[PDB]
């Protein structure tokens, strides 16, 4: 019974039934940030990243 | 001759079995008396096949219990069914994600009739 | 350069609001998980109530019944009783030891066990069993023996087979019993579907359905066991009862022994099904001889009402979950357009 | 924008990788089709080679009210009997008549006249039901019993070979008849009991057509049917040898004198109940032996062909996902 | 004979392995790279020896891993350490409670130096 | 100063590259001793002793064509003057007598894991170890990759795929190397380590079996200090 | 009930007698194996430069340990310095591998347990090193003190390679898989992994560590792991995508990690790797010594078996005695 409470906690995730889509969302915004650094360099100094 | 055929079929089988997903929430409690009957019930409920290595591992776990006086007592009471399905799914995730096909073809050359452990359940649709 | 910076600002704001909505939908799914667990507990309690308290499951003179069977051993025992060590060793035949509230479940268990595991002549010690029958030097049954001599002296004939069953040699159930129950029944683990739910027709194990004369609830065996965890566990070994036959076949991987339905459906092993016109045995379990029935039915009404309340709450939480998913999709396509216009 | 051009060249490289993967998929398909056609020319060669080349039914037909007599009277003169393998008094044979009557009395005439189906859909085909709960006269077997006049009003059963749980023990190595290596009983001493002359699952001489590749996993009838009719039980010589060996018995025991115990508490007594049907005696003939060896090799070839067909279904399931991913990637690339 | 001596040794080892209790609170997260490294770190944290069959299985999982392109990917990222820790404790419960002595006798008859998998961690 | 410590290694190519920088050059990014800046000068010295002077005086360039542009071999197999850094440094400064490594960012196996979200220095989501009781090891400060403070130019878009400098170079120097307080605390949590560990008192364990002991090393070149 | 308890007590007593019989059997086997090793000891008695390169390095601890080898417990725990344990039949390949591993790991001390590694150093409460350490005072009271750092490897903490050993090869080579190009064909300059090419001494091949491992599965795998030796530099460079972590060229050039290339002149690690001896009959002696080591290992494991059974018989007795008292108080109850 000690195994079930941890396996459900790992099967749920940070966001129940949503978190894969939020990972996709973070990767989409990451692509947007990489493109905006590729176009203009100094904007990195605005975004610290 | 037959060696390259077995290697290519092992590559096909492992590339198929990598992509069959594990179920999301399992809340079942199956009374059982052996490991093979437990895996048959877990195939009939969750309509998914189990890997080649898990079937021979459960046959070895069922064969190691032959010869004792505790052979006749029921495995349901020794090992709790939630604790005995958790180990099936964790061993199955290990057997699907990690191995290679050279090992499996080297296993398959040492026996004819290896399709006794490969099962006809297709989880699509 | 300002359009990329505005796109980053708007995308960060929309991602933060979308993440807060993800926290909300996680909280609703957690409330659904808790409420389905509570519904599981209430349905577990209803199945626990339906063992012997309720006088009638929802359906889709025993001495004369023994004496109709002209040739067996229990007929000879009952005709002697209604008229010396063999009268001292025998506890009593298995049709006489049990009692069941409702006629349907008793008839279908009597069709389950068969009409020779119902006329079994039980014994406390193996010395009684080797006193019931005596043999010749070759291996032939002698007519001047335990059960055959007084049978031929009284007139009736044992001509067919009969079981004998030693309480001392039967492997006793060795599992925790149910605490604070005067009938001393067994907490056999109840099966559960992959939803979390019990099977939809499930009414309980069948060893917990028999009501025993309280002389035999304890100390029958010299190791200090009761009739229920030695005899009736070796006749209904996790045998479980469903309501209809479709409910039994629908929940067939969850069984690990036979199963029995209240329509007539009997299966005894895993792959073996029983089909066709249902056989008729003459011996039936007796009916015990009603305020406990009324208290049980009152508690049944209370449990069904509280279960209905839990179903209404899970439905309301599911509706609010659907609304959260809808607003999630709208905000998602909004900021997807906001990022794709750049 | 040179960075968007580098992005488009990475997209074209991933499109080329998906194209190489999908042509690898159809190459694997064509290899499997050639392998299946080799299997099929071998099986047609074996078909033309084969095409070059007291009674049990009189005892079964006397039990007029069951399904076994119905199927016997039909085969002496549909969609049902495509799945029904046969009544279990006809699938097995033992040499000695006394031990035949012993092993027939052990199982009882309701599980000795039992119609084993190959699959659960056949079990659904044998009996059909109304919405009320009674048996339907337009079901499977009851139509045949009323078309003849055979009256199946007695209860019967149905073994489903796909749903039986098989014996996991290894079979005697390099054996002809594929007997089971069951652990023999041993005393507190090192020796066996004095009356022990083998188990009873190893005593039924099963036909060579049914030894291998009956079930979808490649199992016989001794490993499934005649093991789940009687598991692990011992056969002793006399009754005193049976009583003296109680601390070492398995699931059950029978003796040749006529002593049966089914469970570790139940000791049958009284006069012997008769079962009218019993296993037959095997006959010795070499032409039928050669034809049965040909049929065993035929069944093994059919099983290998069906598993190759399972694998081509599996690789089609992979190539559909390859098609879908390549088409979605093409839509994404042409969209931008 | 030699088989009687090795069968007696197998019965001694199985009677010792049955009594070793599984620890009660097992909340831990150890970063690992292979299965054998997890079993060594898991015996060093929790002062208990793993079974013979568990060391054989935990080796053949890595031998089955060797071939493919996953060998350069970190196994910490494939399978979660709490999930792998729970896997090895469940397999260890099975290997302490369930097996017999004849299986161990045959597996030790097939090869010498079977003590390479049996551990000197006594308590 | 950092550049004086570079010029102390006169036979090394780092002082050659710095002298060319004061007065080949296009492909290179720079040396590792200039890219990383650590506030904790003690922890800076300890990680400097961990890496070794051959790895930390090694130059990093963007492409493999820069690797083929620095040094070129002749038909016999010996290194002559006519290679790029060798001639263009022996024209003015000292020759290359010692070995020097070259690390090219397109050939490294880059980190492929979640990066801590909502972060400026773009830290790495590595699994923090835990004792059997449910707590972290008692002197755990952090993984050593997460200490280096990056010039915000190199955080993104150095790799041709768009990866940064922290997840390619600073992962493939000390991957899952974790920092403790004292050496007895490091020995106490020795089974819970991956690849190595580094204690702030001193003491260096580079592999899971082998571990340094004796004096602490002293090397002159260190990481720079932020302002 | 008493009828359970009487049978339970008599089963416990039969169990205790079984454990005493098992102790007797195991002690008989131990005496037999010790008589065997005494017979092998009298048989073995009946059968009866590299150190200069260590002496070039006065600052490292391996020179101090070489002084003590040529002329307490620190010489008992330490197995031996890395350059003294193995032998390479080539001057070129030995020079290339000794340039590879560095002089710190080529002058490394090698221990049995972590206890010997605690015996090598000492650290006071201030955290500063004094000469009250055993190896430091050992070095200072005979010769010079030790200024260069050294590493001590531990044969129990070394995670061993887990692959089948080449079948019945005397040298116990590793069953490493060779690299494959994406056309399925072997690289042209590939002539072997560097871990199989060391000739290792036959006394240390088998049952060194308490598990029964050699020095190739533990020591020489973890120094350099599955690296590939190629003939020339261009065969190493052209086959860059097929290598694992590690590449070595006889022309000159080492690819440490998959993105790190080594250019420039080469710092000569003046310590080299040794050469195997010419054919001498003393190998016969060494053969006997190999057998002796395995014999000692099995005696060790027999001791663990008896210790194992001793623990079990204590749980056979104590419980029994307690259970015995419980029996009579049940007989004192009614």
Author numbering:
A (entry chain G): 45 to 93
B (entry chain B): 39 to 163
C (entry chain F): 43 to 102, 117 to 139, 147 to 352, 357 to 409
D (entry chain E): 46 to 98, 116 to 139, 147 to 405
E (entry chain A): 39 to 161
F (entry chain D): 117 to 139, 149 to 352
G (entry chain C): 52 to 99, 117 to 139, 147 to 409
Copy text verbatim from the article accompanying this structure deposition:
RdDM requires two plant-specific RNA polymerases known as RNA polymerase IV (Pol IV) and RNA polymerase V (Pol V), and a number of accessory proteins with different functions. All together, these observations have positioned the DDR complex as a key component that acts downstream of the methylation readers SUVH2/SUVH9 to recruit Pol V to RdDM loci. We report here the structures of the Arabidopsis Pol V recruitment complexes DR (DMS3-RDM1) and DDR′ (DRD1 peptide 7-DMS3-RDM1). The structures of the two complexes are similar at their core—two DMS3 dimers bridged by an RDM1 dimer.
When co-expressed in E. coli, DMS3, RDM1, and DRD1 peptide 7 formed a stable and isolatable complex that we called the DDR′ complex. Using single-particle cryoEM, we determined the structure of the DDR′ complex to an overall resolution of 3.5 Å. First, DRD1 peptide 7 forms three helices (α1, α2, and α3) and binds to DMS3-RDM1 in the DDR′ complex. Helix α1 is threaded into a symmetric, hydrophobic cleft formed by the RDM1 dimer interface involving the residues Lys121 and Leu128 (inset 1). We attempted to model another DRD1 peptide 7 with the same interactions into the complex, however, this resulted in steric clashes between the two α1 helices. Therefore, the DDR′ complex most likely contains only one molecule of the peptide. A second major difference between the DR and DDR′ complexes is that the disordered CC arm of one DMS3h in the DR complex became ordered and visible in the DDR′ complex (i.e., the CC in DMS3hc2). Combined with the two DMS3 states already seen in the DR complex, we have three different DMS3 states (DMS3h, DMS3hc1 and DMS3hc2) in the DDR′ complex. The newly ordered CC arm is positioned close to the CC arm of DMS3hc1 from the same DMS3 dimer (DMS3hc1(E)-DMS3hc2(F)) in the DDR′ complex in a state that we refer as a “closed” state, and thus the corresponding DMS3 dimer which has a flexible CC arm in the DR complex is referred as an “open” state.
